[PDB]
Amino acid sequence: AVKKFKPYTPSRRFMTVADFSEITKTEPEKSLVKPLKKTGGRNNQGRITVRFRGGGHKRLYRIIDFKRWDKVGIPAKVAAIEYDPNRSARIALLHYVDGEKRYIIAPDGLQVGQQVVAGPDAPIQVGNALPLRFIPVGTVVHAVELEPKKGAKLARAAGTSAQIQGREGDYVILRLPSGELRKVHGECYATVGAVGNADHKNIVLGKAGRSRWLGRRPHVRGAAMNPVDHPHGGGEGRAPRGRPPASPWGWQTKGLKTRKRRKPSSRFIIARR
Amino acid sequence: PITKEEKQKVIQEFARFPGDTGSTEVQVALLTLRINRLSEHLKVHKKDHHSHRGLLMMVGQRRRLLRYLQREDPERYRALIEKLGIRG
RNA sequence: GAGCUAGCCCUGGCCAGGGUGAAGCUGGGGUGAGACCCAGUGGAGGCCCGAACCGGUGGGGGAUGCAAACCCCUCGGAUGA
RNA sequence: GCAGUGAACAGGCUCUGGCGACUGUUUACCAAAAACACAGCUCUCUGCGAACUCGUAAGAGGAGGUAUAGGGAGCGACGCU
RNA sequence: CCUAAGGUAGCGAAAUUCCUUGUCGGGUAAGUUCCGACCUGCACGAAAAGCGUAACGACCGGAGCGCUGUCUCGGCGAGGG
RNA sequence: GCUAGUUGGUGGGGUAAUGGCCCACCAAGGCGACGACGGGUAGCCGGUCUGAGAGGAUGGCCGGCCACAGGGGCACUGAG
RNA sequence: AGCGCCGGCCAACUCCGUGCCAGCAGCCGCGGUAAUACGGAGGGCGCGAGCGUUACCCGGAUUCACUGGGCGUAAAGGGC
RNA sequence: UGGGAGAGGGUGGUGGAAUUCCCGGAGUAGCGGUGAAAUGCGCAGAUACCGGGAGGAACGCCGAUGGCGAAGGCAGCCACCUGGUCCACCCGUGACGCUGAGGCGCGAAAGCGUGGGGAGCAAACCGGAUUAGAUACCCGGGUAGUCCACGCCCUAAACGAUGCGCGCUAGGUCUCUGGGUCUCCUGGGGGCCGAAGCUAACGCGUUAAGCGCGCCGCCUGGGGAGUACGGCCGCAAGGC
RNA sequence: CCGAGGGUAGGGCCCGUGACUGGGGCGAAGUCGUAACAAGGUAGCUGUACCGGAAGGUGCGGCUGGAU
RNA sequence: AAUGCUAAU
Ligand SMILES: [K+]
Ligand SMILES: [K+]
Ligand SMILES: [K+]
Ligand SMILES: [K+]
Ligand SMILES: [K+]
Ligand SMILES: [Mg+2]
Ligand SMILES: [Mg+2]
Ligand SMILES: [Mg+2]
Ligand SMILES: [Mg+2]
Ligand SMILES: [Mg+2]
Ligand SMILES: [Mg+2]
Ligand SMILES: [Mg+2]
Ligand SMILES: [Mg+2]
Ligand SMILES: [Mg+2]
Ligand SMILES: [Mg+2]
Ligand SMILES: [Mg+2]
Ligand SMILES: [Mg+2]
Ligand SMILES: [Mg+2]
Ligand SMILES: [Mg+2]
Ligand SMILES: [Mg+2]
Ligand SMILES: [Mg+2]
Ligand SMILES: [Mg+2]
Ligand SMILES: [Mg+2]
Ligand SMILES: [Mg+2]
Ligand SMILES: [Mg+2]
Ligand SMILES: [Mg+2]
Ligand SMILES: [Mg+2]
Ligand SMILES: [Mg+2]
Ligand SMILES: [Mg+2]
Ligand SMILES: [Mg+2]
Ligand SMILES: [Mg+2]
Ligand SMILES: [Mg+2]
Ligand SMILES: [Mg+2]
Ligand SMILES: [Mg+2]
Ligand SMILES: [Mg+2]
Ligand SMILES: [Mg+2]
Ligand SMILES: [Mg+2]
Ligand SMILES: [Mg+2]
Ligand SMILES: [Mg+2]
Ligand SMILES: [Mg+2]
Ligand SMILES: [Mg+2]
Ligand SMILES: [Mg+2]
Ligand SMILES: [Mg+2]
Ligand SMILES: [Mg+2]
Ligand SMILES: [Mg+2]
Ligand SMILES: [Mg+2]
Ligand SMILES: [Mg+2]
Ligand SMILES: [Mg+2]
Ligand SMILES: [Mg+2]
Ligand SMILES: [Mg+2]
Ligand SMILES: [Mg+2]
Ligand SMILES: [Mg+2]
Ligand SMILES: [Mg+2]
Ligand SMILES: [Mg+2]
Ligand SMILES: [Mg+2]
Ligand SMILES: [Mg+2]
Ligand SMILES: [Mg+2]
Ligand SMILES: [Mg+2]
Ligand SMILES: [Mg+2]
Ligand SMILES: [Mg+2]
Ligand SMILES: [Mg+2]
Ligand SMILES: [Mg+2]
Ligand SMILES: [Mg+2]
Ligand SMILES: [Mg+2]
Ligand SMILES: [Mg+2]
Ligand SMILES: [Mg+2]
Ligand SMILES: [Mg+2]
Ligand SMILES: [Mg+2]
Ligand SMILES: [Mg+2]
Ligand SMILES: [Mg+2]
Ligand SMILES: [Mg+2]
Ligand SMILES: [Mg+2]
Ligand SMILES: [Mg+2]
Ligand SMILES: [Mg+2]
Ligand SMILES: [Mg+2]
Ligand SMILES: [Mg+2]
Ligand SMILES: [Mg+2]
Ligand SMILES: [Mg+2]
Ligand SMILES: [Mg+2]
Ligand SMILES: [Mg+2]
Ligand SMILES: [Mg+2]
Ligand SMILES: [Mg+2]
Ligand SMILES: [Mg+2]
Ligand SMILES: [Mg+2]
Ligand SMILES: [Mg+2]
Ligand SMILES: [Mg+2]
Ligand SMILES: [Mg+2]
Ligand SMILES: [Mg+2]
Ligand SMILES: [Mg+2]
Ligand SMILES: [Mg+2]
Ligand SMILES: [Mg+2]
Ligand SMILES: [Mg+2]
Ligand SMILES: [Mg+2]
Ligand SMILES: [Mg+2]
Ligand SMILES: [Mg+2]
Ligand SMILES: [Mg+2]
Ligand SMILES: [Mg+2]
Ligand SMILES: [Mg+2]
Ligand SMILES: [Mg+2]
Ligand SMILES: [Mg+2]
Ligand SMILES: [Mg+2]
Ligand SMILES: [Mg+2]
Ligand SMILES: [Mg+2]
Ligand SMILES: [Mg+2]
Ligand SMILES: [Mg+2]
Ligand SMILES: [Mg+2]
Ligand SMILES: [Mg+2]
Ligand SMILES: [Mg+2]
Ligand SMILES: [Mg+2]
Ligand SMILES: [Mg+2]
Ligand SMILES: [Mg+2]
Ligand SMILES: [Mg+2]
Ligand SMILES: [Mg+2]
Ligand SMILES: [Mg+2]
Ligand SMILES: [Mg+2]
Ligand SMILES: [Mg+2]
Ligand SMILES: [Mg+2]
Ligand SMILES: [Mg+2]
Ligand SMILES: [Mg+2]
Ligand SMILES: [Mg+2]
Ligand SMILES: [Mg+2]
Ligand SMILES: [Mg+2]
Ligand SMILES: [Mg+2]
Ligand SMILES: [Mg+2]
Ligand SMILES: [Mg+2]
Ligand SMILES: [Mg+2]
Ligand SMILES: [Mg+2]
Ligand SMILES: [Mg+2]
Ligand SMILES: [Mg+2]
Ligand SMILES: [Mg+2]
Ligand SMILES: [Mg+2]
Ligand SMILES: [Mg+2]
Ligand SMILES: [Mg+2]
Ligand SMILES: [Mg+2]
Ligand SMILES: [Mg+2]
Ligand SMILES: [Mg+2]
Ligand SMILES: [Mg+2]
Ligand SMILES: [Mg+2]
Ligand SMILES: [Mg+2]
Ligand SMILES: [Mg+2]
Ligand SMILES: [Mg+2]
Ligand SMILES: [Mg+2]
Ligand SMILES: [Mg+2]
Ligand SMILES: [Mg+2]
Ligand SMILES: [Mg+2]
Ligand SMILES: [Mg+2]
Ligand SMILES: [Mg+2]
Ligand SMILES: [Mg+2]
Ligand SMILES: [Mg+2]
Ligand SMILES: [Mg+2]
Ligand SMILES: [Mg+2]
Ligand SMILES: [Mg+2]
Ligand SMILES: [Mg+2]
Ligand SMILES: [Mg+2]
Ligand SMILES: [Mg+2]
Ligand SMILES: [Mg+2]
Ligand SMILES: [Mg+2]
Ligand SMILES: [Mg+2]
Ligand SMILES: [Mg+2]
Ligand SMILES: [Mg+2]
Ligand SMILES: [Mg+2]
Ligand SMILES: [Mg+2]
Ligand SMILES: [Mg+2]
Ligand SMILES: [Mg+2]
Ligand SMILES: [Mg+2]
Ligand SMILES: [Mg+2]
Ligand SMILES: [Mg+2]
Ligand SMILES: [Mg+2]
Ligand SMILES: [Mg+2]
Ligand SMILES: [Mg+2]
Ligand SMILES: [Mg+2]
Ligand SMILES: [Mg+2]
Ligand SMILES: [Mg+2]
Ligand SMILES: [Mg+2]
Ligand SMILES: [Mg+2]
Ligand SMILES: [Mg+2]
Ligand SMILES: [Mg+2]
Ligand SMILES: [Mg+2]
Ligand SMILES: [Mg+2]
Ligand SMILES: [Mg+2]
Ligand SMILES: [Mg+2]
Ligand SMILES: [Mg+2]
Ligand SMILES: [Mg+2]
Ligand SMILES: [Mg+2]
Ligand SMILES: [Mg+2]
Ligand SMILES: [Mg+2]
Ligand SMILES: [Mg+2]
Ligand SMILES: [Mg+2]
Ligand SMILES: [Mg+2]
Ligand SMILES: [Mg+2]
Ligand SMILES: [Mg+2]
Ligand SMILES: [Mg+2]
Ligand SMILES: [Mg+2]
Ligand SMILES: [Mg+2]
Ligand SMILES: [Mg+2]
Ligand SMILES: [Mg+2]
Ligand SMILES: [Mg+2]
Ligand SMILES: [Mg+2]
Ligand SMILES: [Mg+2]
Ligand SMILES: [Mg+2]
Ligand SMILES: [Mg+2]
Ligand SMILES: [Mg+2]
Ligand SMILES: [Mg+2]
Ligand SMILES: [Mg+2]
Ligand SMILES: [Mg+2]
Ligand SMILES: [Mg+2]
Ligand SMILES: [Mg+2]
Ligand SMILES: [Mg+2]
Ligand SMILES: [Mg+2]
Ligand SMILES: [Mg+2]
Ligand SMILES: [Mg+2]
Ligand SMILES: [Mg+2]
Ligand SMILES: [Mg+2]
Ligand SMILES: [Mg+2]
Ligand SMILES: [Mg+2]
Ligand SMILES: [Mg+2]
Ligand SMILES: [Mg+2]
Ligand SMILES: [Mg+2]
Ligand SMILES: [Mg+2]
Ligand SMILES: [Mg+2]
Ligand SMILES: [Mg+2]
Ligand SMILES: [Mg+2]
Ligand SMILES: [Mg+2]
Ligand SMILES: [Mg+2]
Ligand SMILES: [Mg+2]
Ligand SMILES: [Mg+2]
Ligand SMILES: [Mg+2]
Ligand SMILES: [Mg+2]
Ligand SMILES: [Mg+2]
Ligand SMILES: [Mg+2]
Ligand SMILES: [Mg+2]
Ligand SMILES: [Mg+2]
Ligand SMILES: [Mg+2]
Ligand SMILES: [Mg+2]
Ligand SMILES: [Mg+2]
Ligand SMILES: [Mg+2]
Ligand SMILES: [Mg+2]
Ligand SMILES: [Mg+2]
Ligand SMILES: [Mg+2]
Ligand SMILES: [Mg+2]
Ligand SMILES: [Mg+2]
Ligand SMILES: [Mg+2]
Ligand SMILES: [Mg+2]
Ligand SMILES: [Mg+2]
Ligand SMILES: [Mg+2]
Ligand SMILES: [Mg+2]
Ligand SMILES: [Mg+2]
Ligand SMILES: [Mg+2]
Ligand SMILES: [Mg+2]
Ligand SMILES: [Mg+2]
Ligand SMILES: [Mg+2]
Ligand SMILES: [Mg+2]
Ligand SMILES: [Mg+2]
Ligand SMILES: [Mg+2]
Ligand SMILES: [Mg+2]
Ligand SMILES: [Mg+2]
Ligand SMILES: [Mg+2]
Ligand SMILES: [Mg+2]
Ligand SMILES: [Mg+2]
Ligand SMILES: [Mg+2]
Ligand SMILES: [Mg+2]
Ligand SMILES: [Mg+2]
Ligand SMILES: [Mg+2]
Ligand SMILES: [Mg+2]
Ligand SMILES: [Mg+2]
Ligand SMILES: [Mg+2]
Ligand SMILES: [Mg+2]
Ligand SMILES: [Mg+2]
Ligand SMILES: [Mg+2]
Ligand SMILES: [Mg+2]
Ligand SMILES: [Mg+2]
Ligand SMILES: [Mg+2]
Ligand SMILES: [Mg+2]
Ligand SMILES: [Mg+2]
Ligand SMILES: [Mg+2]
Ligand SMILES: [Mg+2]
Ligand SMILES: [Mg+2]
Ligand SMILES: [Mg+2]
Ligand SMILES: [Mg+2]
Ligand SMILES: [Mg+2]
Ligand SMILES: [Mg+2]
Ligand SMILES: [Mg+2]
Ligand SMILES: [Mg+2]
Ligand SMILES: [Mg+2]
Ligand SMILES: [Mg+2]
Ligand SMILES: [Mg+2]
Ligand SMILES: [Mg+2]
Ligand SMILES: [Mg+2]
Ligand SMILES: [Mg+2]
Ligand SMILES: [Mg+2]
Ligand SMILES: [Mg+2]
Ligand SMILES: [Mg+2]
Ligand SMILES: [Mg+2]
Ligand SMILES: [Mg+2]
Ligand SMILES: [Mg+2]
Ligand SMILES: [Mg+2]
Ligand SMILES: [Mg+2]
Ligand SMILES: [Mg+2]
Ligand SMILES: [Mg+2]
Ligand SMILES: [Mg+2]
Ligand SMILES: [Mg+2]
Ligand SMILES: [Mg+2]
Ligand SMILES: [Mg+2]
Ligand SMILES: [Mg+2]
Ligand SMILES: [Mg+2]
Ligand SMILES: [Mg+2]
Ligand SMILES: [Mg+2]
Ligand SMILES: [Mg+2]
Ligand SMILES: [Mg+2]
Ligand SMILES: [Mg+2]
Ligand SMILES: [Mg+2]
Ligand SMILES: [Mg+2]
Ligand SMILES: [Mg+2]
Ligand SMILES: [Mg+2]
Ligand SMILES: [Mg+2]
Ligand SMILES: [Mg+2]
Ligand SMILES: [Mg+2]
Ligand SMILES: [Mg+2]
Ligand SMILES: [Mg+2]
Ligand SMILES: [Mg+2]
Ligand SMILES: [Mg+2]
Ligand SMILES: [Mg+2]
Ligand SMILES: [Mg+2]
Ligand SMILES: [Mg+2]
Ligand SMILES: [Mg+2]
């Protein structure tokens, strides 16, 4: 339900914004926020290592619980759905019967007032977290660990999900958000349901300034540069590429594969994306 | 569906005399019950056009009955629409 | 050597006055119910006019200069990248 | 009274082509533009100790992000293609 | 006859046309520029995108009106030298 | 879709006389698919021609009414 | 004493000349070497101080059908 | 009030047959295709066979001159929500009716927009044949599209080329579905043959194109032309 | 004050005309093919979409005003 | 599997 605007300015003609109607609380929980260090794409040497970054809105980091086997068997009540500036998905504030408060990625269909629980004996309901081997084949899951007790790594962006395809010994075959079929250890944890905020990809930024609000600085084409700066630089007037298209550092950028050939995890990938 | 109990309750509610089942008031009340239930159904089943034609037929029949009642007894007509909340 | 200049990071400050009138909301209309329509309210925007401020368009002057880039008239932006 | 924003401050207008959609940015000191950027479109890489960048390395950035994400390339609102 | 295949839609004397001030129409008393067409495209053409496009531009063309020491064509006066 | 003296009211001016005819003020009305408004065409009738009738066409001459007097506007005199 | 007509509609026919030419024509159509259809002649028919032609109106036209038409396949039933 | 039949509509599930693809097994000299071939596929191991898995789309027999719907249309099975319609009882109201210029809603296929999906088929496109040529018919491939959600488009041989309502005018025969006094009679649908009548004829004929009444739409020689202009609608194609 | 008329500016509608460009009707003869009428030699027609010198072809659905 | 036949009874 993306919100549109009448064209009372040139930029408002196309710009769309998120509805925000699912958000119930407008201030983050004080005990679960930490200051976030803006880098501008610089490393500890002070050098730009990722180009065209910096200058966005100030942000606070919210601590997300990505290892839900920490509190197996202790139910929690969903207190609120909140805005999180650091990720595309919304977050959910959990009020454990323990009196402990934690944030999780808010799944699609989670409501304030429901009960969630983690553990091998949890019901198969949206928001519950279980080891993969206890979850039926065909279930849609998100926030999936890659290796046991190492933290959720897969299917965390808004609207993404993974689906269990089958079992093989100690391993469970998963279809990843990218379409890749992968074997994941059956003792890895996952949460039932898909990530919410599936409309996030329908947002139209509308103007250059909105990209700047998000910390994305302007991108300069290689063909706009001089030969000293880029393989595509130079030429009198506009020029075609004049060679296979390349990065600023020389490698070809249309089809050249870059995954390391002899990587150990290749034994656990059944079909590439 | 509409069971016999609620229909009989409506019939007793709106009938003039105890043995009456086909007066204008009772017919209007039964039509209003059916129209309310069908409109509630159509609020969820939007693509149910075939049922919507029947709803249009019911609305037209009730309009004809109300016109006749208003033309033959304005006091009865006003009392009936006030009791049913028809106007709009 | 980044006390000039380019980018970024932390923490502060500044932007006279006037105009336009989005959404939302309220009331009326409309209908089987609606979608919609009208008025009022409302105060949105890399919105408008214009000083500070930031620029530097056209012309004239300056040319062993007031000045190793200035002066005068004119001109762009001015709640935002 | 010749004359009433009586002094000062305060758009000349219209018609019709090219280029760029638009607000912006740029050769400090001869070029402000049709150049750059831009929302948007497409291709391609990347399953996470991710690809990629800096570094001899340790270690950083990427990101306390996880394919609705991140990098690279070309095109550059929108309409018809 | 030759080729891997022989330029499709659209556009065209063009920010692209050498002959060239092509030719025809318009605008002017008179128009190498301008606008509308034709196609003989030296040497347009589909994301180094093709053809359009309201709004926007200290961008670059062409025309008219208003008004003027720009000019016919110069004259006088003021202040600083 | 049309209308702002427009539609109505009050008071007045003017006329032989009613009247928004004209003026000042008050209200927001008036007209329209039964065709308003706009465009085109046209002097109208008794009659005439045609036709089995119904109808169609037409309005020269003659009798009646209206309009006009180089193209527009205006008043004076007067019963007019 | 003249004018029109003489293939059918429509009343009134033969000869010569020409040869898809010249020409006629309201419609259908005539004329390309034996033309009652073109031109002339003889004859005939209709009107006659007239006879033809053009223009316009009604009729025939029940072909806007009130009197007095239609819509399966001829024009015509609206997608429901 | 009591009952009936039905691919009428919407939503959620789930059954097997078959095609395709992948994995494994076994196995070898061609398969496929046509009028005849060739392109193509195949020793880098195809075709034919067996086992396992995935996915999409459509529902064989029943099945019909059958049924339902206002039309367009509707077909595996199950559940839920919902429309219409028929019969019996003769209970209630008391003319409350018919038609309908505009308006509103629905409306095959193709087409358009944004997401998803994609087995098979298949406009455009590529190649092989055929042929004088072959921008086709035949063959091998192949993208939109065909499917789903939402939103547009609004057309057709949208046909019974037959507007709707009501009454009256021999019958015979087949069939679906009710009630009864279940030989048979009495309702409601769908077909065939035929009285009278009608029609230019073909044909129609109680499901009228007969005899009548009411209301609506449409026609006035063929072409130009469903064109142009104007107006309204649509993102476009284009529609009225 | 009103006021015939004249002037200035901006609109609405209509008529004539225009380089060029699009189709239409016609023709006792031309060029290219042969789409329809017979099962017209691929049944025809039709709405829509894409394509092709041209008539037309193909896809999806529909009708019989076709056959079996 | 096979295209065509102007123009005066
Ligand atoms: K760029
Ligand atoms: K408002
Ligand atoms: K200009
Ligand atoms: K040219
Ligand atoms: K050129
Ligand atoms: Mg918007
Ligand atoms: Mg708005
Ligand atoms: Mg708007
Ligand atoms: Mg705007
Ligand atoms: Mg704009
Ligand atoms: Mg803007
Ligand atoms: Mg913008
Ligand atoms: Mg806050
Ligand atoms: Mg804090
Ligand atoms: Mg350092
Ligand atoms: Mg250093
Ligand atoms: Mg980088
Ligand atoms: Mg950076
Ligand atoms: Mg920045
Ligand atoms: Mg930021
Ligand atoms: Mg900030
Ligand atoms: Mg968030
Ligand atoms: Mg994210
Ligand atoms: Mg930000
Ligand atoms: Mg960036
Ligand atoms: Mg970025
Ligand atoms: Mg920057
Ligand atoms: Mg940026
Ligand atoms: Mg780039
Ligand atoms: Mg360059
Ligand atoms: Mg450069
Ligand atoms: Mg180098
Ligand atoms: Mg280099
Ligand atoms: Mg280069
Ligand atoms: Mg070059
Ligand atoms: Mg260059
Ligand atoms: Mg250079
Ligand atoms: Mg150059
Ligand atoms: Mg250059
Ligand atoms: Mg060049
Ligand atoms: Mg350059
Ligand atoms: Mg170029
Ligand atoms: Mg270049
Ligand atoms: Mg070059
Ligand atoms: Mg390049
Ligand atoms: Mg090159
Ligand atoms: Mg290269
Ligand atoms: Mg490359
Ligand atoms: Mg990797
Ligand atoms: Mg330094
Ligand atoms: Mg510095
Ligand atoms: Mg600095
Ligand atoms: Mg400093
Ligand atoms: Mg700086
Ligand atoms: Mg900065
Ligand atoms: Mg900073
Ligand atoms: Mg800071
Ligand atoms: Mg600060
Ligand atoms: Mg700060
Ligand atoms: Mg600061
Ligand atoms: Mg302050
Ligand atoms: Mg300011
Ligand atoms: Mg200010
Ligand atoms: Mg202010
Ligand atoms: Mg201000
Ligand atoms: Mg303003
Ligand atoms: Mg203001
Ligand atoms: Mg205002
Ligand atoms: Mg404001
Ligand atoms: Mg502004
Ligand atoms: Mg402004
Ligand atoms: Mg302005
Ligand atoms: Mg401005
Ligand atoms: Mg401005
Ligand atoms: Mg200033
Ligand atoms: Mg300043
Ligand atoms: Mg500055
Ligand atoms: Mg300054
Ligand atoms: Mg300044
Ligand atoms: Mg600068
Ligand atoms: Mg300047
Ligand atoms: Mg000057
Ligand atoms: Mg100047
Ligand atoms: Mg100067
Ligand atoms: Mg000066
Ligand atoms: Mg100068
Ligand atoms: Mg000088
Ligand atoms: Mg100077
Ligand atoms: Mg200097
Ligand atoms: Mg200065
Ligand atoms: Mg100044
Ligand atoms: Mg200024
Ligand atoms: Mg300004
Ligand atoms: Mg500025
Ligand atoms: Mg600026
Ligand atoms: Mg501005
Ligand atoms: Mg500013
Ligand atoms: Mg300011
Ligand atoms: Mg300003
Ligand atoms: Mg401002
Ligand atoms: Mg601010
Ligand atoms: Mg502002
Ligand atoms: Mg800002
Ligand atoms: Mg005075
Ligand atoms: Mg004077
Ligand atoms: Mg004066
Ligand atoms: Mg005055
Ligand atoms: Mg002044
Ligand atoms: Mg003044
Ligand atoms: Mg003054
Ligand atoms: Mg002053
Ligand atoms: Mg000004
Ligand atoms: Mg200004
Ligand atoms: Mg002026
Ligand atoms: Mg101008
Ligand atoms: Mg011009
Ligand atoms: Mg031009
Ligand atoms: Mg311009
Ligand atoms: Mg030019
Ligand atoms: Mg261009
Ligand atoms: Mg620009
Ligand atoms: Mg530019
Ligand atoms: Mg533009
Ligand atoms: Mg543009
Ligand atoms: Mg742009
Ligand atoms: Mg553009
Ligand atoms: Mg741009
Ligand atoms: Mg453009
Ligand atoms: Mg702007
Ligand atoms: Mg600005
Ligand atoms: Mg601006
Ligand atoms: Mg600017
Ligand atoms: Mg600019
Ligand atoms: Mg700048
Ligand atoms: Mg700047
Ligand atoms: Mg800068
Ligand atoms: Mg720049
Ligand atoms: Mg320089
Ligand atoms: Mg400079
Ligand atoms: Mg500069
Ligand atoms: Mg600098
Ligand atoms: Mg320098
Ligand atoms: Mg300069
Ligand atoms: Mg410059
Ligand atoms: Mg500038
Ligand atoms: Mg600028
Ligand atoms: Mg400059
Ligand atoms: Mg500029
Ligand atoms: Mg550029
Ligand atoms: Mg630049
Ligand atoms: Mg934009
Ligand atoms: Mg956009
Ligand atoms: Mg675009
Ligand atoms: Mg992309
Ligand atoms: Mg990418
Ligand atoms: Mg990569
Ligand atoms: Mg990189
Ligand atoms: Mg290392
Ligand atoms: Mg690192
Ligand atoms: Mg970091
Ligand atoms: Mg890191
Ligand atoms: Mg990326
Ligand atoms: Mg990218
Ligand atoms: Mg590209
Ligand atoms: Mg490329
Ligand atoms: Mg650019
Ligand atoms: Mg573009
Ligand atoms: Mg570019
Ligand atoms: Mg072309
Ligand atoms: Mg061009
Ligand atoms: Mg062009
Ligand atoms: Mg030229
Ligand atoms: Mg020329
Ligand atoms: Mg051009
Ligand atoms: Mg030239
Ligand atoms: Mg030259
Ligand atoms: Mg010349
Ligand atoms: Mg010239
Ligand atoms: Mg010329
Ligand atoms: Mg000429
Ligand atoms: Mg001229
Ligand atoms: Mg001129
Ligand atoms: Mg002239
Ligand atoms: Mg002239
Ligand atoms: Mg002239
Ligand atoms: Mg001349
Ligand atoms: Mg000329
Ligand atoms: Mg010039
Ligand atoms: Mg010039
Ligand atoms: Mg010129
Ligand atoms: Mg020119
Ligand atoms: Mg030109
Ligand atoms: Mg020109
Ligand atoms: Mg020419
Ligand atoms: Mg042309
Ligand atoms: Mg040429
Ligand atoms: Mg071009
Ligand atoms: Mg291309
Ligand atoms: Mg290129
Ligand atoms: Mg290219
Ligand atoms: Mg471009
Ligand atoms: Mg263009
Ligand atoms: Mg352009
Ligand atoms: Mg436009
Ligand atoms: Mg605009
Ligand atoms: Mg524009
Ligand atoms: Mg414009
Ligand atoms: Mg504007
Ligand atoms: Mg503009
Ligand atoms: Mg403006
Ligand atoms: Mg501007
Ligand atoms: Mg402009
Ligand atoms: Mg500009
Ligand atoms: Mg300038
Ligand atoms: Mg300038
Ligand atoms: Mg500029
Ligand atoms: Mg200039
Ligand atoms: Mg120009
Ligand atoms: Mg200009
Ligand atoms: Mg000029
Ligand atoms: Mg002039
Ligand atoms: Mg002038
Ligand atoms: Mg002088
Ligand atoms: Mg002078
Ligand atoms: Mg002067
Ligand atoms: Mg002069
Ligand atoms: Mg001179
Ligand atoms: Mg001189
Ligand atoms: Mg001179
Ligand atoms: Mg002189
Ligand atoms: Mg002088
Ligand atoms: Mg002198
Ligand atoms: Mg002088
Ligand atoms: Mg003097
Ligand atoms: Mg002098
Ligand atoms: Mg002097
Ligand atoms: Mg002197
Ligand atoms: Mg002085
Ligand atoms: Mg002196
Ligand atoms: Mg002196
Ligand atoms: Mg008055
Ligand atoms: Mg009056
Ligand atoms: Mg009145
Ligand atoms: Mg009479
Ligand atoms: Mg008589
Ligand atoms: Mg009579
Ligand atoms: Mg008369
Ligand atoms: Mg008269
Ligand atoms: Mg007169
Ligand atoms: Mg006279
Ligand atoms: Mg007298
Ligand atoms: Mg008198
Ligand atoms: Mg005879
Ligand atoms: Mg003859
Ligand atoms: Mg004769
Ligand atoms: Mg003879
Ligand atoms: Mg004769
Ligand atoms: Mg003779
Ligand atoms: Mg008679
Ligand atoms: Mg007759
Ligand atoms: Mg008659
Ligand atoms: Mg008759
Ligand atoms: Mg009649
Ligand atoms: Mg008839
Ligand atoms: Mg018929
Ligand atoms: Mg008939
Ligand atoms: Mg026919
Ligand atoms: Mg007819
Ligand atoms: Mg017919
Ligand atoms: Mg029908
Ligand atoms: Mg029809
Ligand atoms: Mg239908
Ligand atoms: Mg082989
Ligand atoms: Mg095998
Ligand atoms: Mg599949
Ligand atoms: Mg149906
Ligand atoms: Mg029904
Ligand atoms: Mg009874
Ligand atoms: Mg009674
Ligand atoms: Mg009736
Ligand atoms: Mg009516
Ligand atoms: Mg449809
Ligand atoms: Mg169909
Ligand atoms: Mg479809
Ligand atoms: Mg589609
Ligand atoms: Mg072929
Ligand atoms: Mg051959
Ligand atoms: Mg095929
Ligand atoms: Mg196939
Ligand atoms: Mg495909
Ligand atoms: Mg039908
Ligand atoms: Mg019909
Ligand atoms: Mg009929
Ligand atoms: Mg009807
Ligand atoms: Mg029967
Ligand atoms: Mg029967
Ligand atoms: Mg029969
Ligand atoms: Mg029969
Ligand atoms: Mg029968
Ligand atoms: Mg008949
Ligand atoms: Mg007729
Ligand atoms: Mg049309
Ligand atoms: Mg039109
Ligand atoms: Mg539109
Ligand atoms: Mg049409
Ligand atoms: Mg004309
Ligand atoms: Mg055919
Ligand atoms: Mg044939
Ligand atoms: Mg044929
Ligand atoms: Mg033949
Ligand atoms: Mg054939
Ligand atoms: Mg055939
Ligand atoms: Mg054929
Ligand atoms: Mg046939
Ligand atoms: Mg056939
Ligand atoms: Mg077809
Ligand atoms: Mg298409
Ligand atoms: Mg084809
Ligand atoms: Mg033949
Ligand atoms: Mg033949
Ligand atoms: Mg031939
Ligand atoms: Mg033959
Ligand atoms: Mg023959
Ligand atoms: Mg023949
Ligand atoms: Mg023959």
UniProtKB/Swiss-Prot annotation, chain A:
Residues 222-273 are annotated as: Disordered. The keyword Signal does not apply. GO terms for biological process: cytoplasmic translation. Signal peptide: none annotated. It holds the Pfam family Ribosomal_L2. Residues 229-239 have a biased composition (Basic and acidic residues). SUPFAM superfamilies: Nucleic acid-binding proteins (SSF50249), Translation proteins SH3-like domain (SSF50104). GO terms for cellular component: large ribosomal subunit. Coiled coil: none annotated. Disulfide bonds: none annotated. Residues 256-273 have a biased composition (Basic residues). Keywords: Ribonucleoprotein, Ribosomal protein, RNA-binding, rRNA-binding. GO terms for molecular function: rRNA binding; structural constituent of ribosome; transferase activity. The keyword Ribonucleoprotein applies. Belongs to the universal ribosomal protein uL2 family. Part of the 50S ribosomal subunit. Forms a bridge to the 30S subunit in the 70S ribosome, contacting the 16S rRNA. May also make transient contacts with protein S6 during translation in the 70S ribosome. HAMAP family: Ribosomal_uL2_B (MF_01320_B). One of the primary rRNA binding proteins. Required for association of the 30S and 50S subunits to form the 70S ribosome, for tRNA binding and peptide bond formation. It has been suggested to have peptidyltransferase activity; this is somewhat controversial. Makes several contacts with the 16S rRNA (forming bridge B7b) in the 70S ribosome. This is Large ribosomal subunit protein uL2. It comes from Thermus thermophilus (strain ATCC 27634 / DSM 579 / HB8). The gene is rplB.
From Swiss-Prot, chain B:
GO terms for molecular function: rRNA binding; structural constituent of ribosome. Coiled coil: none annotated. The keyword Ligase does not apply. One of its GO terms (cellular component) is cytosolic small ribosomal subunit. InterPro entries: Ribosomal_uS15, Ribosomal_uS15_bac-type, uS15_NS1_RNA-bd_sf. Belongs to the universal ribosomal protein uS15 family. PANTHER family: RIBOSOMAL PROTEIN S15, BACTERIAL AND ORGANELLAR (PTHR23321), SMALL RIBOSOMAL SUBUNIT PROTEIN US15M (PTHR23321:SF26). One of the primary rRNA binding proteins, it binds directly to 16S rRNA where it helps nucleate assembly of the platform of the 30S subunit by binding and bridging several RNA helices of the 16S rRNA. Forms an intersubunit bridge (bridge B4) with the 23S rRNA of the 50S subunit in the ribosome. HAMAP family: Ribosomal_uS15_B. This is Small ribosomal subunit protein uS15. The lineage of its organism: Bacteria, Thermotogati, Deinococcota, Deinococci, Thermales.
